[PDB]
Amino acid sequence: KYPRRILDVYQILQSPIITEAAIKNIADENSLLFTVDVRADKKMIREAISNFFGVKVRKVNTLIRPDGTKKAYIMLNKEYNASELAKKIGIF
């Protein structure tokens, strides 16, 4: 019942990434890029996106940068579309 750690769930997602490679990844993989907290997990991020936008998450992959900042690859299920969700935010 307990999570791994305890902190602000609304801080798990700071902001997305806007790069020519990231935008290229949305159309090919149906994925999304998000900078995340260092203390975050794949479970909290999976639960997070399920609540904000109301969409299913096929898989989550993460990594820690050299600067101590964690990044999160989020692949949505094929039923939904990351490009459609992208336009809802404002970024293409």
Tell me which residues touch other proteins (CB under 8 A). Answer: 2-3, 6-10, 13-16, 18, 47-48, 51-54, 88-91
Q: Does 23 bind RNA (CB under 7 A)?
A: no
Report the nearest approach of RNA to the CB of residue 64 (Å): 4
Is residue 71 part of the contact set for RNA (CB under 7 A)?
A: yes
* Contacted entry of RNA, other proteins, none for residue 80, CB cut-off 5 to 8 Å set by kind: none
Could you write out the DSSP letters of every residue in the chain? ---SS-S-GGGSEEEE---HHHHHHHHHH-EEEEEE-TT--HHHHHHHHHHHT---EEEEEEEE-TTS-EEEEEEEPTTS-HHHHHHHHT--
Nearest distance, CB of residue 70 and RNA, angstroms = 6
SS (HEC) of 23-49 = HHHHHHHCEEEEEECCCCCHHHHHHHH
Residues between 46 and 65 with contacts to RNA, criterion CB under 7 A: 46, 57-59, 61-65
Q: What's the closest the beta carbon of residue 77 comes to other proteins, in angstroms? A: 18
